[PDB]
Amino acid sequence: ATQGVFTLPANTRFGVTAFANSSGTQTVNVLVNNETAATFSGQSTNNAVIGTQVLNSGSSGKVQVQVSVNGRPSDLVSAQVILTNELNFALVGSEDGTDNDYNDAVVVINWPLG
Amino acid sequence: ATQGVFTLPANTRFGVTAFANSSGTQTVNVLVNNETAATFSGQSTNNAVIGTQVLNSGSSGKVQVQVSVNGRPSDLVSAQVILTNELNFALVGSEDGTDNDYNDAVVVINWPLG
Amino acid sequence: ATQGVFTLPANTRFGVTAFANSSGTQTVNVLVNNETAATFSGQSTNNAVIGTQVLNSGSSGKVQVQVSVNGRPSDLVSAQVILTNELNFALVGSEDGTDNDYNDAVVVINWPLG
Amino acid sequence: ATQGVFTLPANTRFGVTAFANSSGTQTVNVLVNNETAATFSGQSTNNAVIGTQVLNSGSSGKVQVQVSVNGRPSDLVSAQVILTNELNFALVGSEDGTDNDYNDAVVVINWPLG
Ligand SMILES: CO[C@@H]1OC[C@@H](O)[C@@H](O)[C@@H]1O
Ligand SMILES: CO[C@@H]1OC[C@@H](O)[C@@H](O)[C@@H]1O
Ligand SMILES: CO[C@@H]1OC[C@@H](O)[C@@H](O)[C@@H]1O
Ligand SMILES: CO[C@@H]1OC[C@@H](O)[C@@H](O)[C@@H]1O
Ligand SMILES: [Ca+2]
Ligand SMILES: [Ca+2]
Ligand SMILES: [Ca+2]
Numbered sequence: 001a002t003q004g005v006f007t008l009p010a011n012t013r014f015g016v017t018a019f020a021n022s023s024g025t026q027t028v029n030v031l032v033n034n035e036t037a038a039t040f041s042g043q044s045t046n047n048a049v050i051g052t053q054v055l056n057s058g059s060s061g062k063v064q065v066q067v068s069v070n071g072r073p074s075d076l077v078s079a080q081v082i083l084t085n086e087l088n089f090a091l092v093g094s095e096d097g098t099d100n101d102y103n104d105a106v107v108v109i110n111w112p113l114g
Numbered sequence: 115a116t117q118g119v120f121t122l123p124a125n126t127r128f129g130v131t132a133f134a135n136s137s138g139t140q141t142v143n144v145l146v147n148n149e150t151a152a153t154f155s156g157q158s159t160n161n162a163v164i165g166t167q168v169l170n171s172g173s174s175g176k177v178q179v180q181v182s183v184n185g186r187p188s189d190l191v192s193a194q195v196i197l198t199n200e201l202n203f204a205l206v207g208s209e210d211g212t213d214n215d216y217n218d219a220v221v222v223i224n225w226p227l228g
Numbered sequence: 229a230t231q232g233v234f235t236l237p238a239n240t241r242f243g244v245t246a247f248a249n250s251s252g253t254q255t256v257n258v259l260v261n262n263e264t265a266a267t268f269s270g271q272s273t274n275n276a277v278i279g280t281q282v283l284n285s286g287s288s289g290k291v292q293v294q295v296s297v298n299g300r301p302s303d304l305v306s307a308q309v310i311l312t313n314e315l316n317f318a319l320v321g322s323e324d325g326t327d328n329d330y331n332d333a334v335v336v337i338n339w340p341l342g
Numbered sequence: 343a344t345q346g347v348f349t350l351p352a353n354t355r356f357g358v359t360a361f362a363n364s365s366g367t368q369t370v371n372v373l374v375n376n377e378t379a380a381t382f383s384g385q386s387t388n389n390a391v392i393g394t395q396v397l398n399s400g401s402s403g404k405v406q407v408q409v410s411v412n413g414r415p416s417d418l419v420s421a422q423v424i425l426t427n428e429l430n431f432a433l434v435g436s437e438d439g440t441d442n443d444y445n446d447a448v449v450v451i452n453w454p455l456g
């Protein structure tokens with residue numbers, strides 16, 4: 001199944017933050033309406049924040065996270081969880097290798113903000 | 115029900131990261147085995163990452179998040195999510211006021227690292 | 229925080245199923261737009277299905293689960309999780325006693341159907 | 343990533359319940375320690391509970407859900423969610439066709455019981 005794809009309400013500000021846990025240099029691209037709206041990169045085996053930004057979901061509400069290491073797309077896992085019918089988390093894990101820890105780049109999307 | 119309390123595997127590194135979305139200054143306390151192990155504070159209505167840290171879950175694995183605003187404890191909501199039976203997120207929202215957006219301080223705990 | 233309340237898409241069929249894990253008979257009420265849409269009653273300490281029904285979210289999309297034992301409201305815990313940006317679960321646990329297992333009545337709401 | 347595989351605590355009672363939402367007859371197999379422990383079959387486009395059962399995770403704690411339709415394995419999507427650090431749900435959706443609703447068989451595992 002498709003992973004790392006989320007539908008947000010239109011024209012909604014959302015946070016996106018990425019962490020790295022790998023010997024591979026992570027590139028995290030955040031697409032809004034199928035167009036790259038943010039790009040983060042970095043390398044850490046200690047969960048370093050490699051990027052954080054506030055974006056707007058725009059007219060489509062279409063948000064997609066992609067992760068690559070050396071030009072190769074990582075395998076993604078994702079889900080959305082909603083707390084008290086108000087607070088949204090869109091969560092993404094990724095695997096760049098053979099150990100199946102899925103933490104190589106970890107991406108957290110949250111909304112609403114403010 | 116108790117919120118913001120999580121049983122992690124014992125003696126395991128985890129990331130804890132806090133975001134602010136309130137006019138009130140947030141103070142986030144992270145307890146490991148009932149002792150403060152980290153404290154983050156800031157004020158933002160735009161999802162500022164007021165703190166991020168790697169901690170060890172210790173002998174019990176008990177991790178507790180508490181949030182206060184001008185010395186008043188915020189109301190918490192929480193859940194844990196596991197993807198592909200490997201990637202763990204413990205999630206906390208908090209409310210310091212009356213609008214019930216529960217984003218006033220948002221705390222994300224993630225493991226495993228490395 | 230409020231628990232057991234969910235905003236579904238309008239005019240959408242959803243499944244509701246309730247399980248019992250308590251020595252006391254559980255009364256589960258499902259409200260749609262603040263009015264009774266279904267009520268389940270049964271007793272099991274072995275996860276018996278005490279009710280299952282297809283309902284419609286109607287014009288409000290507001291669905292609320294309440295649980296009581298002997299007319300005394302149980303303490304609720306809930307969340308919504310969305311898989312592959314398509315499949316929705318609204319989950320409820322309840323506690324009627326002192327052991328905090330929160331399984332005394334467990335309610336699972338799923339959509340879309342068909 | 344592997345889906346539909348969950349590690350439960352050893353020797354834990356759990357419920358497993360399967361719902362159908364497809365023109366195709368669903369076959370759901372539940373394995374414990376790599377051996378079939380429950381099987382359900384049925385066709386519904388109205389979220390019928392095609393089966394529910396209580397099992398024990400045994401010494402391994404390894405529980406796997408498989409879904410097939412007329413001999414072909416469905417594509418699975420899964421996650422686990424824990425409420426109030428106590429109440430567990432392991433969630434499975436599956437897709438047997440082209441519309442990607444992932445509801446064709448839905449499987450919910452819950453613990454603790456009792
Ligand atoms: C060579 O493997 C990569 O770096 C070290 C670990 O973080 C692994 O999970 C990762 O896939
Ligand atoms: C005065 O209210 C506080 O600041 C503005 C908003 O962020 C509110 O959600 C928050 O509770
Ligand atoms: C009297 O206690 C009730 O019945 C037995 C157990 O299922 C308990 O969890 C429940 O609260
Ligand atoms: C022919 O398609 C199958 O039956 C009707 C719908 O339930 C579809 O989701 C399912 O994949
Ligand atoms: Ca890896
Ligand atoms: Ca890694
Ligand atoms: Ca607020």
Ligand SMILES: [Ca+2]
Nearest residue numbers: 114135136218
């Ligand atoms: Ca706020």
Ligand SMILES: [Ca+2]
Nearest residue numbers: 324325329330
């Ligand atoms: Ca109980």
Ligand SMILES: [Ca+2]
Nearest residue numbers: 249250332456
């Ligand atoms: Ca119980």
Ligand SMILES: [Ca+2]
Nearest residue numbers: 439443444446
């Ligand atoms: Ca389908």
Ligand SMILES: [Ca+2]
Nearest residue numbers: 342363364446
């Ligand atoms: Ca279907």
